[PDB]
């Protein structure tokens, strides 16, 4: 019964574990999702720090729900009439009936099985820990960083760093759990609809009479029946198996997969409990420079001017004073009378890269509010006035990539809904990291028009803006 200790004490097995799990390679955080890097980011260590955990778990959950609803209705109407006289008699009848039945059935079943067979946890030492066993960055990565920071101009440095981190990855796994996990999920949905109808209608008549033996009779009869049966049925079954660790060739055979969980050659990383930014692994003077250069936006504090008009609102509305300097942008209307924030992108536009800022365009219908040119982006304020797509100050108002913004908290002003305007404020956090700017952005709750866009509820991250970069 071998464990991670036996693997780690053997150079062949230890190196097989390192290689088969990409433990020397960082993870690239592309917009399509995380993928391992093919470049080795750290130097191969002589040993690994591990702890042993063999507490296996199997958990199976089954849930079934059924519902049936049968409706029945029926009607009958009858009429009978007779007239008489010593010479003639007459008669009629009318019988009508209707029937209706409807049945709706819904069933649902889902089963979820998870087999968790851990082996332990492997830890790497980050420089901030201060311990002597520490992951050494590969000389090639250090050389690449030096070459990037050696470029003449800031944009060249930034593009070199972008290429370097696209090749080497943006994060590194410093704690990983080794073992094998097998998962199964079944979903079955069923529906049936039965509808049945019947209509009948019978009519009858008669006439009879006689005089002096010159008798006679007549009769008539009409009937009519209609029927309908409509039946509809649907079934959907979806089954998915996922294996991560163990003998994958035994994915469809749970017993043999479980039997294979003790074989070292199949142990895999089943979860990551610590991830470190690849920039955090650098020496400090290089670390700060790399962090600064990776910020998507520059920043500048500017004078502000109250926007005249708007006398009816409870709070004064302010905007950038003067023209926005060339190449810069502004983010919305604010109650801050002291200053407002200007931003400029740091990276040019390139294929396969989502820009930090998006342009805003005048609304399609019944709304003077701006709309984001790209789908998921956001802007921090409503527009108090008519949004000019092509002229200042509207031409330089910009929205933000969604990763730049975090939800804020409103702060309402005004007694009545006709003048209720929010002063968005940052959500306070214990970590002084996800901190956002107290721009005091204004959002009017009731926009007069129709088809208006979603009410802004976001503040800008401080970690995304670079000040005093002298650029």
């Amino acid at each position: 019964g071998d464990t991670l200790n036996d693997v780690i004490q053997d150079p062949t097995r230890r190196n097989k574990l390192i290689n088969d799990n990409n433990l020397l390679k960082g993870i690239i955080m592309g917009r399509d999702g995380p993928v391992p890097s093919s470049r080795e980011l750290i130097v191969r260590p002589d040993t690994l720090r591990a702890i042993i955990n063999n507490r296996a778990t199997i958990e199976t959950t089954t849930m079934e729900a059924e519902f049936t609803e049968t409706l029945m209705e029926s009607n009958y109407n009858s009429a009978s009439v007779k007239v008489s006289a010593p010479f003639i008699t007459a008669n009629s009848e009318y019988s009508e009936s209707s029937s209706f039945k409807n049945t709706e059935t819904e069933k649902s079943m889902y089963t979820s099985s998870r087999y968790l067979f851990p082996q332990g946890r492997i830890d790497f030492t980050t420089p901030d820990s201060g311990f002597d066993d520490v992951i050494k960055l590969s000389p090639q990565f250090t050389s690449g960083v030096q070459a990037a920071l050696a470029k003449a101009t800031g944009t060249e440095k930034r593009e070199a760093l972008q290429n370097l981190f696209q090749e080497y990855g943006h994060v590194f796994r410093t704690k990983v759990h080794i073992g094998g996990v097998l998962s199964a999920h079944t979903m079955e949905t069923f529906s049936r609809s039965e509808n049945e109808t019947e209509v009948k209608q019978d009519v009858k008549a008669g006439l009879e009479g006689a005089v002096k033996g010159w008798g006679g009779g007549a009769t008539a009869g009409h009937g009519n029946t209609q029927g309908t049966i409509t039946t509809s049925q649907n079934r959907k079954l979806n089954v998915k198996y996922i294996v991560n660790g163990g003998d994958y060739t035994k994915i469809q055979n749970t017993e043999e997969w479980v039997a294979s969980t003790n074989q070292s050659e199949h142990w895999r990383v089943i979860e990551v409990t610590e991830v470190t930014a690849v920039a955090d692994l650098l020496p400090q003077p290089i670390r700060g420079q790399v962090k600064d250069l990776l910020k998507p936006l520059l920043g500048k504090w500017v004078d502000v001017e109250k926007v005249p008009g708007l006398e009816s609102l409870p709070v004064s509305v302010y905007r950038p004073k003067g023209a926005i300097p060339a190449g810069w942008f502004w983010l919305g209307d604010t109650a801050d009378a002291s200053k407002a924030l200007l931003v400029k992108p740091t990276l040019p536009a390139r294929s396969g890269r989502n820009p930090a800022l998006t342009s805003l365009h005048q609304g399609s219908g019944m709304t003077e509010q701006p709309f984001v040119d790209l789908p998921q982006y956001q802007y921090l304020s409503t527009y108090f006035g008519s949004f000019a797509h092509d002229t200042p100050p509207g031409s330089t108002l910009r929205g933000l990539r969604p990763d730049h913004v975090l939800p804020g908290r409103y702060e309402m002003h005004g007694d009545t809904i006709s003048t209720a305007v929010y002063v968005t404020r940052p959500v306070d956090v214990p970590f002084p990291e996800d901190e956002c700017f107290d721009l005091k952005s204004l959002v009017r709750v009731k926009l007069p028009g129709s088809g208006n866009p979603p009410k802004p509820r976001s503040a800008l991250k401080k970690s995304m803006v670079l000040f005093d970069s002298g650029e």
Binding site: G365, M366, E368, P448
Partner: protein, 135 residues
Amino acid sequence: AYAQWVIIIIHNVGSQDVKIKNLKASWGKLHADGDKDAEVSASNYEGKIVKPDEKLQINASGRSDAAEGTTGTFDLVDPADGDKQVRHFYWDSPWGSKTNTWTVSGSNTKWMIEYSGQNLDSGALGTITVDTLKK
């Protein structure tokens, strides 16, 4: 009669003013807010200018339970460009016929309108909000 009543709620939702002109009620009368007995002449509403956040409400109803319907017309015009016609709106609440008429006319690609709350089927025409956007 007071059973024939109508409320014109003109609501500017652009940022440029609009002006009421030609507002006359051929039938019925025009009254103040809420109360129908306090009849008010059309002179108070003729030529008035509506601002972006402002609402102007016309309250027209028939003669006092005299079986008289209420009807009228008005035009919205652009004081910016010298009162060029924006739209012509006609309302009618006739005692004789339970059907009601709310017709909007005019033409401007340089201005947009939306209206809601109109009831032409039966009964009083009803309060109708017309949102005006100078696209």
